[PDB]
Symmetry: C2
């Protein structure tokens, strides 16, 4: 299989944050993602733990229960920025955060992800995840919400 990079990964808060895209996908449950026929790409945030991750993740593990918002702006650029909220999902190459997106034609785009930890009140997965805090098995506090941004040139799949 082939995927396409959006810039190069950025390392922050003990995680590698990478942006990639591929053709639009189909997902179970149906009717949540924008229809593949009405989309240009499936954009993803690939987030994995670095070595000595402060929240207890072994190096390379997928970081679960995050909430990621995105804003894609065409440089530059008559249309409104493209925005959305990713969904966590599994594919044949493992779990990702992703969304089907309709772009605004070929050209240069700015991509910004805003990444919320699993204790953020804005993150609807926060009620379902915890963090040990006892001395023997506890980990460091969650990172604070942050953003990452890249530029990429979209030509079309």
């Amino acid at each position: 299989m082939l995927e396409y990079p959006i810039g190069t990964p950025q390392n922050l808060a003990g995680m590698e944050i990478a942006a990639v895209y591929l053709q639009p996908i189909d997902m179970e449950p149906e009717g949540h993602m924008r229809k593949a026929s009405e989309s240009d790409i499936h954009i993803e945030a690939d987030i994995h733990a670095l070595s000595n991750n402060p929240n207890g993740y072994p190096e390379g593990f997928w970081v679960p229960f995050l909430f990621i918002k995105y804003e894609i702006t065409k440089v530059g650029g008559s249309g409104a920025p493209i925005t959305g909220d990713m969904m966590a999902m599994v594919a044949s190459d493992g779990p990702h955060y992703g969304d089907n997106v309709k772009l605004q034609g070929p050209g240069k785009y700015k991509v910004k992800y805003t990444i919320y930890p699993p204790n953020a009140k804005e993150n609807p997965m926060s009620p379902y995840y915890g963090r040990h805090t006892d001395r023997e098995t506890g980990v460091r506090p969650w990172f604070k919400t942050f953003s990452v941004e890249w530029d990429f040139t979209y030509a079309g799949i």
Copy 2:
């Protein structure tokens, strides 16, 4: 601190299902886990992907967004079964499903876990996790809810 085994792991549906326990833990958010001072153990379900996992997980990955119910019964003795729902959480050794539990003194206990996939109606994370189904990046359907059982001897902690 010791991590005690509950039986030996069992392999089903491309996953290793293991049961272990340790001393009661403290967790953020507070007020979800039974107080550590009012508990005997923290019981865990350790679920990781085997090779050729049918849902797309690389070997060794934690299997996320499951929902686990447990039933702990003192073998052939007085006392009702002890039931509850685990919660997903991260510790210094990575993510787990777990819960703080009060037992009924030393002795032999049966431990049964009932494991619900992300698309089960009983799993509250169903609106928050998907599975690709397109030909190029799709995976096999989720497993159906199933149970696994072991027993162990509790001596104290």
